[PDB]
Amino acid sequence: MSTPAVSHRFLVNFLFNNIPNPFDIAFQRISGLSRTLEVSQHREGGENVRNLWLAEQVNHGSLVLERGVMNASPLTLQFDRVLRRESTQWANVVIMLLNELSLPVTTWTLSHALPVRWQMGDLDAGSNQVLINTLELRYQDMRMLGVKL
């Protein structure tokens, strides 16, 4: 059987409408994409032994990203504009894992992602650590691709 996919190589591509060039930014800690369907349980009168689950509404999670405090990229300059309320532009994000050669084995492809939260790491006098800042986006739809679905 083919070997499963490990989780320490990944590219992320962003495409805003403010910014003319699509840019690719390296992260440390992409959190993880959930997708819940939100059923509800109904209880019938004469039926006491089975359950009844009724499908309603697909809920998508959130894209939480982590990287170090490095030079100003086109994405930390873009969260600065949205969190100062100077723009409300959102982007189409493409996230993909890479195998041993270079090849994309799975792709996640988020749509209309909106920057909603910046979170700075701690400043501590005895710490021995890189200052990590936490970024967080809310998207509208999600569409996973690739050969390793």
Next chain:
Amino acid sequence: MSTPAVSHRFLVNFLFNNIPNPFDIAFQRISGLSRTLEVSQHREGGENVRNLWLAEQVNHGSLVLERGVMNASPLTLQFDRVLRRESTQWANVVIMLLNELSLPVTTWTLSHALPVRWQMGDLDAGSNQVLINTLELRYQDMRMLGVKL
């Protein structure tokens, strides 16, 4: 006395109505099937020393499944259709333990299981781990079989 059953060999069979062939998929971490009867306590006027429990409604749990990110099976292509709301098909699931030879010693046999949640593992730069995705189903009835009940 006969030896108790260990919990590291198990097959899972799915049968959808979209898909013409019944398929068998290997998982890592089937969670566990609960079945509660949901009694309620009544308090009588003159009786202060005994209790009174009244049976109402059988509640079934949920089938949480875990496997690695591998090639696209007929079940991850089927959760993709249900969570994109292109179908609302559900399946009859058969789960069974195996003894030393090959023989099914217990069988759990779920009915009308509906895919309700996908959950992706973490992408971390220093991680050394397989990307595990978490699948979750809500079924209507449950019927355990086998010789080791």
Next chain:
Amino acid sequence: MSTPAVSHRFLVNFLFNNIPNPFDIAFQRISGLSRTLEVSQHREGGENVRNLWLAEQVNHGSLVLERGVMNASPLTLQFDRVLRRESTQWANVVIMLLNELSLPVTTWTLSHALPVRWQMGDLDAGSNQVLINTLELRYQDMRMLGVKL
């Protein structure tokens, strides 16, 4: 002074009305029987320094049982009938500790116990463990006997 009672030898006897023979089943992990009296605090006008507790209603706990997945006993066939709602029979349970010889030193003697919950253990590919299932009963009255009360 006489030696206290240790907690790793115990018999459990069940008596249903469906089943003509009283059967005795070995468990791993009987949880523990509580019995609360449910007082309530009243506050009087001129009295600020003492309390006033008024007795109401005796609340009994629950009998949670654990054993491995073994061959089908007359009790796991009986929880299967009650949780499929084919019967609502309940049993008189007798639990007793044993001393060094064989002798029952304490006896707990539950009345009208009703099977209310089945809970299956986890199926994990690397686990090295016996599949333990958890059983749970709600009884009406409780009456402890024996010489070591």
Next chain:
Amino acid sequence: TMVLPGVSYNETLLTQASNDDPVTMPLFIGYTPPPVTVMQPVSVGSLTQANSLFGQRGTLAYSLRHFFENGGLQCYVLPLGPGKGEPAARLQELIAALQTPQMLETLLADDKTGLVLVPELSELNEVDADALWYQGWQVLLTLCRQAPQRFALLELPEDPASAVTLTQQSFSADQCQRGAAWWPRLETSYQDESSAPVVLSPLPAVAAAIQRSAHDNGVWKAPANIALAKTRRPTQSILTSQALLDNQGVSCNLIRSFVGKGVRLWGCRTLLNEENTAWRYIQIRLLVSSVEHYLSKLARAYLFEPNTAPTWMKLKGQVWTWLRQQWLAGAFFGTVEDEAFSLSIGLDETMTEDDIRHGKMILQVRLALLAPAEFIAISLTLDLRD
């Protein structure tokens, strides 16, 4: 064409199955009415089954009709044969048939009934009558003494100084304990095929009042204060025959009628005329044998077990649970459990090591029972207060 499915009409009986209650089940042992087997007891269900088996006119046939119209649930009938005729000869072959050893092989191997009743000894009134009455009771009082849990339902002759000489007759204490007589014979409302009424023994009306006030109220209550349904009057009142008030014989039960309420059963007190021994009061004999019937049901569940001390305490825990629930249901006297019942199985409590090696398992039950309210002793106090 072949078949015509539609709506028909017929008078077949669907029937019902199993009313249980073996202790308060009557057993009628009259002669077969003129294709049931000549000896095996027959389960009679509703009153429709009593007519489809035994007709409508006879002596056993009127007693079954007076059983189910007084609220009887289920009865068994033990036939004996198509009797002779010339009724002074049927009624000494009846007693001679009840003295056979083939009666014991049918009563001991029965385990479905618990009230022995021969309603055809009322025909002795027409008819030595005294000799026939005493070996009519004493044959029935030994078939119940011998059987594990049966109670005789007896009756007195109508004429005083023939009912006086029957109570002033010798009966052993063991036998009196289990059997009762109700004196006044009942004048029913059934026609005798003419204007005159049918006069039946009170005992099919009694056995229906026993097992309905044990089904409704519990067997511990009392069989008395029950209105008899389809009776005009008792044939003799106690205001015209002050005999049987002589305190020199077996206890008797009076059936009377009142003004604002009908014909009442007015007594529950066995043939033991003993003031302290609590084996009088019918419901005491019928409660403690209803506890015999269930405690020996769960005793023989633990029968071919080891005689080790775990199986002794497996049996106490089941008996203690059951006896505590009947105390909280109102069957036993006592405001605490320590004075309601007691259990004492063990190795040097009841048994001994010689009893264990012979394969015995001895369990002791003590009980505290309820007393009737037979007499209300009203008093009045003035309490002056200025």
Next chain:
Amino acid sequence: VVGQGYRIFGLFDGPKEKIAGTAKPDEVMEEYPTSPFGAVFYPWGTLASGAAVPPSAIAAASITQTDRTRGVWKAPANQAVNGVTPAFAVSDDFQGKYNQGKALNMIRTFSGQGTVVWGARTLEDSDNWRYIPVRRLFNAVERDIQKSLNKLVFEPNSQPTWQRVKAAVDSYLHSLWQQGALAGNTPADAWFVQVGKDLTMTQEEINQGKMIIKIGLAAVRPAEFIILQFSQDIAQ
């Protein structure tokens, strides 16, 4: 085959006709051997398809259900056999005549427990070999020991081989003690195995190829009688 020693247990039949009650237990029980390897079981069956089941087959079908769920040391009696019905109703005054002596072993039906076999005694009334459990326990012990010791035949008849015999029996009987088959609250009160050169066999008996092992072991006797002693007093 009992005189040849084959460790079997016979299950015979009672009379197909109704035993009266004036019949005597001596003249009725004279067809049957006086060996402790047999039981008789009177009342014949009336199977639901109208056919008649021999009462040895009712008794053998309650041995299968007992030898799984409880073991060979537990009585085959109170286990209920389905689909059969006793032909005759039997009282317990009738079984009291037929219990001591040759042990007829009735087949009785009760409300609840439908058509159990009611009795567990063999064809001799002795202190050792009454009770079908304690005979069939030793039949299972003596056959599982010789299946273990037949793999030690034609070994050299020496003192290292005698130690391997008595440790193969102590290992069998210790597992049998700790599952309830043997009566004793310590291993010294439940069994003993003994083999020596001045204990169980002599040197003139070694030279014939013989190896005498003596094994004593205590079995658990069942309860057969339950006495319910009742007291009451009204309003006290």
